[PDB]
Scaffold this motif. Structure first.
Motif, PDB file in Angstrom:
ATOM      1  N   UNK A   1       0.834  -1.196   0.000  1.00 52.63           N
ATOM      2  CA  UNK A   1       0.000   0.000   0.000  1.00 52.63           C
ATOM      3  C   UNK A   1       0.870   1.247   0.000  1.00 52.63           C
ATOM      4  N   UNK A   2       1.903   1.280   0.852  1.00 54.02           N
ATOM      5  CA  UNK A   2       2.794   2.441   0.891  1.00 54.02           C
ATOM      6  C   UNK A   2       3.447   2.665  -0.462  1.00 54.02           C
TER       7      UNK A   2
ATOM      8  N   UNK B   1      -6.401   9.384  -2.042  1.00 55.47           N
ATOM      9  CA  UNK B   1      -6.751   8.025  -2.449  1.00 55.47           C
ATOM     10  C   UNK B   1      -6.913   7.225  -1.165  1.00 55.47           C
ATOM     11  N   UNK B   2      -8.055   6.573  -1.007  1.00 51.14           N
ATOM     12  CA  UNK B   2      -8.312   5.845   0.233  1.00 51.14           C
ATOM     13  C   UNK B   2      -7.559   4.533   0.317  1.00 51.14           C
ATOM     14  N   UNK B   3      -7.353   4.059   1.544  1.00 46.35           N
ATOM     15  CA  UNK B   3      -6.768   2.752   1.744  1.00 46.35           C
ATOM     16  C   UNK B   3      -7.590   1.674   1.006  1.00 46.35           C
ATOM     17  N   UNK B   4      -8.923   1.770   1.048  1.00 46.63           N
ATOM     18  CA  UNK B   4      -9.788   0.772   0.426  1.00 46.63           C
ATOM     19  C   UNK B   4      -9.590   0.729  -1.091  1.00 46.63           C
ATOM     20  N   UNK B   5      -9.275   1.878  -1.707  1.00 48.43           N
ATOM     21  CA  UNK B   5      -8.957   1.905  -3.141  1.00 48.43           C
ATOM     22  C   UNK B   5      -7.627   1.189  -3.393  1.00 48.43           C
TER      23      UNK B   5
ATOM     24  N   UNK C   1      -1.058   5.510  11.378  1.00 50.11           N
ATOM     25  CA  UNK C   1      -1.016   6.940  11.115  1.00 50.11           C
ATOM     26  C   UNK C   1      -0.179   7.242   9.859  1.00 50.11           C
ATOM     27  N   UNK C   2       0.947   6.552   9.654  1.00 53.59           N
ATOM     28  CA  UNK C   2       1.798   6.828   8.490  1.00 53.59           C
ATOM     29  C   UNK C   2       1.063   6.569   7.178  1.00 53.59           C
ATOM     30  N   UNK C   3       0.251   5.497   7.111  1.00 54.41           N
ATOM     31  CA  UNK C   3      -0.572   5.266   5.915  1.00 54.41           C
ATOM     32  C   UNK C   3      -1.632   6.330   5.807  1.00 54.41           C
ATOM     33  N   UNK C   4      -2.289   6.684   6.926  1.00 56.09           N
ATOM     34  CA  UNK C   4      -3.320   7.723   6.869  1.00 56.09           C
ATOM     35  C   UNK C   4      -2.744   9.045   6.330  1.00 56.09           C
ATOM     36  N   UNK C   5      -1.474   9.356   6.626  1.00 53.08           N
ATOM     37  CA  UNK C   5      -0.842  10.580   6.106  1.00 53.08           C
ATOM     38  C   UNK C   5      -0.756  10.548   4.571  1.00 53.08           C
ATOM     39  N   UNK C   6      -0.429   9.380   4.026  1.00 53.33           N
ATOM     40  CA  UNK C   6      -0.336   9.196   2.563  1.00 53.33           C
ATOM     41  C   UNK C   6      -1.718   9.211   1.924  1.00 53.33           C
ATOM     42  N   UNK C   7      -2.719   8.602   2.573  1.00 54.13           N
ATOM     43  CA  UNK C   7      -4.082   8.654   2.072  1.00 54.13           C
ATOM     44  C   UNK C   7      -4.583  10.093   2.035  1.00 54.13           C
ATOM     45  N   UNK C   8      -4.265  10.874   3.080  1.00 55.68           N
ATOM     46  CA  UNK C   8      -4.720  12.261   3.133  1.00 55.68           C
ATOM     47  C   UNK C   8      -4.003  13.113   2.082  1.00 55.68           C
TER      48      UNK C   8
ATOM     49  N   UNK D   1       7.031  -4.992  -1.819  1.00 52.22           N
ATOM     50  CA  UNK D   1       6.593  -4.992  -0.437  1.00 52.22           C
ATOM     51  C   UNK D   1       7.696  -4.740   0.583  1.00 52.22           C
ATOM     52  N   UNK D   2       8.852  -4.154   0.173  1.00 50.40           N
ATOM     53  CA  UNK D   2       9.913  -3.900   1.146  1.00 50.40           C
ATOM     54  C   UNK D   2      10.113  -2.450   1.547  1.00 50.40           C
ATOM     55  N   UNK D   3       9.243  -1.535   1.063  1.00 48.14           N
ATOM     56  CA  UNK D   3       9.272  -0.157   1.558  1.00 48.14           C
ATOM     57  C   UNK D   3       8.179  -0.017   2.597  1.00 48.14           C
ATOM     58  N   UNK D   4       8.499   0.437   3.776  1.00 46.98           N
ATOM     59  CA  UNK D   4       7.495   0.660   4.780  1.00 46.98           C
ATOM     60  C   UNK D   4       6.807   2.008   4.558  1.00 46.98           C
ATOM     61  N   UNK D   5       5.658   2.231   5.217  1.00 49.53           N
ATOM     62  CA  UNK D   5       5.046   3.556   5.167  1.00 49.53           C
ATOM     63  C   UNK D   5       6.017   4.658   5.595  1.00 49.53           C
ATOM     64  N   UNK D   6       6.791   4.453   6.671  1.00 51.41           N
ATOM     65  CA  UNK D   6       7.738   5.502   7.079  1.00 51.41           C
ATOM     66  C   UNK D   6       8.843   5.713   6.045  1.00 51.41           C
ATOM     67  N   UNK D   7       9.306   4.646   5.403  1.00 49.79           N
ATOM     68  CA  UNK D   7      10.335   4.778   4.378  1.00 49.79           C
ATOM     69  C   UNK D   7       9.815   5.601   3.205  1.00 49.79           C
ATOM     70  N   UNK D   8       8.552   5.376   2.823  1.00 44.46           N
ATOM     71  CA  UNK D   8       7.985   6.174   1.751  1.00 44.46           C
ATOM     72  C   UNK D   8       7.822   7.612   2.191  1.00 44.46           C
ATOM     73  N   UNK D   9       7.297   7.844   3.393  1.00 41.67           N
ATOM     74  CA  UNK D   9       7.109   9.217   3.877  1.00 41.67           C
ATOM     75  C   UNK D   9       8.411   9.983   3.870  1.00 41.67           C
TER      76      UNK D   9
END
Ligand code: NI
Ligand code: NI
Lengths: 302, 306
Positions: free
Chosen positions: A208-209, A260-264, A249-256, A289-297
């Motif tokens: 997802x991230x 684009x919603x997590x469900x999408x 929270x890190x995923x929610x930051x990217x969704x915001x 699948x090896x980048x975490x949400x924080x790594x992307x942020x």
């Protein structure tokens, strides 16, 4: 912009690497304060690594059995004044405190977490790369003979978090090691015998991230109004070798940020897992699948 | 075993990262011996970066226009005693020699070469990663605003080769910088205009190295008796956006170790470029061209019987 596999600068860790020798075995260690940590199989002769009795091997040693050399920077032989075994590690006490000990913590990472590795040979740092702890508690790194004792770490706010000490290669391109409490990731035993690895899974939250990173790098063809709810996705994941999605929270930051919603994104995973069908995302034709949400942020404009 | 993108340990470079300030602009810089290097756009006010007149901006400065500070690691007390503009870099002379200057040289890499990047922000090293200079003399990195002055380097045999100082983002995920002679890779200008990038190409020799790494990691499904000669392959490459193959000792080492000829690997490239047919190589469904033959030999070459 751009997304690359990024490691934490290694200098603070390089200043803590030493070489450790016991008889004819040499490997790397980590020197913090008056302590040197290294894999306990340094005590085992090369031709006896099949089923060692480490309690018996430990009793036969004295402080003089271990030689420690600081090879890079100001070279020095460090005198061992005590020794003990902590799980699959040896804990050596030396007479000199490392004057370049960084602020640090010891942590055990969970499956799905990323960390940097400083690969070392004979107490010399040779390479830096990033890995992720797989679902089966292995890592997919690049290590050769003599790399034992190489160090995995993260960095935040000027503090080094030491998370891994390299112990062995399980199978092609598959490795494991221990946290600094001496517990082996995946509960693998430090011996030459064949050991079964559990089945791996794609880390959903990391995929997802990565899809959010793709959107923030101008790749959004896979985003549809289609949604899959978390509960429904998780039932599907249990049957398709994906991990359960748990919100953060890190995923929610990217969704915001992207709108684009997590469900999408969960709907996109289901579609992309069936196949990319002649299309690419960030140059790839398979899910990453090896980048975490924080790594992307860390790699997106704030 | 395994094959990962590997960077050179960064500590020796981290000890050389400083901050340079001119007026309201603060950039990352590199301190070696009695010299500090930084991008010349430090002389340009933030709201005038579109099309600066650097010759005019330089004339308005003196040594006291520049402040060099090092607030991380071993701190330093530096005074600028000379300055000049060298291409797209400012070259400052300071009164104190960096006591942690590594043995080093300056080099300009060619397309197809790899190097490590120490990304810095606010004078602080933040990340390490490896790039390859693309056929069009750009790099595909990961940089945000404030990363100029970040340093690209290699290390071998105890010598750090400083090859790049970051300047700008050309387009999504595409970057450039200068070598330490102040020449911008790709001849891009340090101005905020539209600048055309030439077409890129897949680096054949690197793809061949990667395929040998795959064989040495137990992935050999793509090796067949089929061969394509170098001359024939090169004529095909000129039409399919691949670079010309020129033989090297590092590739010959991999051919000898595996028993798979270069011509078999060139045939595999032609087949794999048409498509992977639902199979993977080292977890990938596309060709990888950013590992050089020497980078592969570091991760795969072991003892050789003679
Ligand atoms: Ni070992
Ligand atoms: Ni800048």
């Amino acid at each position: 912009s751009g997304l690359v596999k990024m490691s934490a600068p290694s200098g603070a860790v390089e200043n803590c690497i030493v070489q450790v020798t016991c008889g004819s075995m040499t490997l790397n260690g980590l020197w913090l304060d008056n302590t040197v940590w290294c894999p306990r199989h340094i005590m085992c002769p090369a031709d006896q690594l099949t089923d060692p009795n480490y309690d018996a091997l430990l009793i036969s040693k004295t402080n003089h059995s271990f030689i420690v050399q600081k090879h890079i920077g100001a070279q020095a032989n460090l005198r061992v004044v005590a020794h003990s075994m902590v799980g699959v590690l040896l804990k050596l006490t030396v007479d000199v405190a490392n004057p370049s000990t960084p602020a640090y913590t010891f942590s055990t990472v969970k499956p799905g977490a990323s960390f940097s590795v400083l690969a070392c040979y004979n107490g010399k740092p040779t390479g830096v790369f990033t890995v992720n702890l797989r679902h089966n508690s292995t890592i997919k790194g690049s290590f050769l003979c003599g790399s034992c004792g190489s160090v995995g770490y993260t960095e935040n706010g000027g503090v080094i978090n030491f998370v891994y000490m390299h112990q062995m290669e399980l199978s092609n391109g598959t490795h494991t090691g221990s946290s600094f409490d001496g517990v082996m990731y995946g509960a693998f035993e430090d011996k030459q015998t064949h050991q079964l690895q559990l089945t791996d899974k794609y880390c959903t939250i990391n995929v997802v991230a990565w899809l959010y990173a793709a959107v923030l790098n101008g790749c959004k063809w896979f985003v549809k109004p289609t949604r899959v709810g978390i509960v429904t996705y998780n039932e599907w994941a249990l049957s398709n070798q994906f991990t359960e999605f748990v919100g953060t929270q890190s995923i929610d930051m990217l969704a915001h940020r992207t709108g684009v919603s997590v469900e999408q994104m969960l709907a996109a995973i289901q579609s992309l897992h069936a196949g990319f069908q002649g299309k690419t995302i960030l140059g790839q034709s398979t899910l990453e699948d090896e980048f975490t949400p924080d790594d992307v942020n860390m790699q997106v404009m704030g």
